[PDB]
Design a protein around this ligand. Structure first.
Ligand code: HEM
Ligand SMILES: C[C@@]12CCC[C@H]1[C@@H]1CC[C@H]3CC(=O)CC[C@]3(C)[C@H]1CC2
Ligand SMILES: [Cl-]
Length: 406
């Protein structure tokens, strides 16, 4: 492969390890190309922390030079990750906190202890599915039977999505994220998803229930109520984020522990906490690869570099998790005993830091020990090295996870 000053992100994810290494080497700020569209990539831990609190980088797409000039339009296959309805995801400044508060309040750890019985029930239900699927030593897809449905069940219970609509949502998201989806079909799926969530908020407005979507609609606290667009916007972000990332976290942790048996023993024998094994997974093999996208409202001088006004800036969180300056020379290794396991920023940093990190950590802390307690000899039916990524450029999405129960 020839040398180039712009690092093209392969949409097929054929060499993720090599790409992540090249990003780190060319960092901590590099030029990248996203399906023919240029941007900058932040690949250093320290510089990411600084820029994630810099008020001169905004989420609003109208600040993008290439959106203003009309050179990037809705035909860009990744536009559904950026040009979205108004929500906590797209707002900065004082307006942002108003759109986050009820969600952060609902997602505090102690508030989540009321949801913990539900998580435990779904984990138990889907392990029963695993037991039936894996009878007579048959090969079982851990993703389809267990890891893929569980987070959609949990987030649906929190937000109020009916049990009978979840398979359709999953089908829509798979099309939304896959780069093979024809662009005209992807934009219609986005419109169909918007339509569903719009009617869901109108149904919850007329008949509220014990869920967060009703709390966003009502529960004013004395401040200006959220607009219909804002409620729908937060609902869409929460379901999309709450499902996509957690499926990856569950699967990557199982793969990391099954490929490092000595470390799986440490958490099963109670010498290292399962929570620590989860943090090292987030640092080393976390759900987000690249986070689109931030835009400079003015020129940002970084000493020996300048982010021009209007430039798009991506947070390459996977490369950031392999930061050798922060984690040492063995940063590319999975090691749940490392002293910097919980110092990652895989949930982000600054105002837009993930509001559901406590829920993500709770789902994994329940599912993982329950899986290995139920199936103590679970092992891969396919070499773990050969499980491919789905063609989703921005997310760490595994295709299928063939196992034997043992
Ligand atoms: C499972 C592991 C998860 C990871 C690794 C993760 C990662 C992230 C990151 C890195 C961001 C912000 C990116 C940035 O602004 O630079 C974010 C935002 C967000 N996440 Fe999480 N997430 C996870 C789980 C969840 C869950 C369970 C939920 C919902 C309960 C959730 C809901 C959200 C929302 C609504 C935002 C947007 C917040 C804002 O922009 O102010 N995520 N997530
Ligand atoms: C990048 C993530 C993982 C962490 C945050 C997620 C996005 C939140 C906003 C919503 C907003 C949407 O209606 C589309 C999906 C989107 C961009 C999420 C995609 C997946
Ligand atoms: Cl060069």
């Amino acid at each position: 492969c020839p040398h180039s000053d712009t690092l093209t992100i392969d949409p097929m994810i054929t060499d993720l390890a090599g790409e992540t290494s090249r990003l780190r080497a060319a960092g901590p700020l590099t030029r990248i190309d996203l399906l023919g569209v240029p941007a900058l990539a932040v690949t250093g831990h320290t510089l990411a922390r600084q820029l994630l609190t810099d008020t001169r980088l905004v989420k609003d797409i109208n600040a993008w030079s290439l959106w203003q000039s009309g050179t990037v339009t809705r035909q860009w296959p990744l536009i559904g990750m950026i040009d979205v309805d108004r929500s906590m995801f797209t707002v900065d400044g004082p307006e942002h906190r108003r759109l986050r508060i009820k969600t952060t309040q609902a997602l505090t750890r102690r508030r989540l202890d009321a949801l913990k019985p539900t998580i435990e029930r779904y984990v138990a239900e889907l392990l029963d599915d695993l037991e039936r699927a894996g009878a007579d030593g048959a090969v079982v897809d851990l993703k389809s039977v267990f890891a893929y449905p569980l987070p959609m069940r949990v987030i649906s219970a929190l937000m109020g999505v009916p049990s009978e609509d979840q398979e359709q949502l999953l089908t829509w998201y798979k099309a939304f994220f896959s780069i093979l989806t024809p662009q005209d079909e992807r934009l219609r799926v986005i419109d169909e998803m918007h339509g569903y969530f719009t009617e869901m908020v109108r149904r919850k407005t007329a008949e509220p229930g014990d869920d967060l979507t009703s709390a966003l609609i009502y529960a004013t606290d004395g401040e200006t109520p959220l607009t219909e667009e804002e409620v729908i916007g937060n609902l869409q972000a929460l379901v999309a984020a709450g499902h996509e990332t957690t499926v990856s976290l569950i699967l990557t942790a199982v793969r990391a522990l099954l490929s490092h048996p000595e470390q799986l023993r440490l958490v099963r024998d109670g010498e290292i906490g399962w929570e620590t094994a989860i943090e090292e997974t987030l640092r080393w093999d976390g759900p987000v690869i690249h986070l689109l996208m931030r835009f400079a409202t003015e020129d940002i001088d970084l000493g020996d570099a300048v982010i021009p006004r209007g430039e798009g800036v991506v947070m390459s969180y996977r490369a950031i998790g392999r930061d050798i300056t922060v984690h040492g020379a063995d940063a590319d290794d999975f090691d749940i005993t490392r002293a910097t396991a919980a110092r990652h920023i895989s949930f982000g940093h600054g105002p837009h830091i993930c509001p559901g990190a406590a829920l993500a950590r709770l789902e994994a802390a329940i599912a993982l020990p329950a899986l290995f307690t139920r199936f103590p000899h679970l092992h891969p039916a396919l070499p773990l090295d050969q499980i491919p990524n789905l063609p989703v450029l921005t997310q760490n999405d595994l295709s299928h996870f063939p196992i034997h129960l043992g």
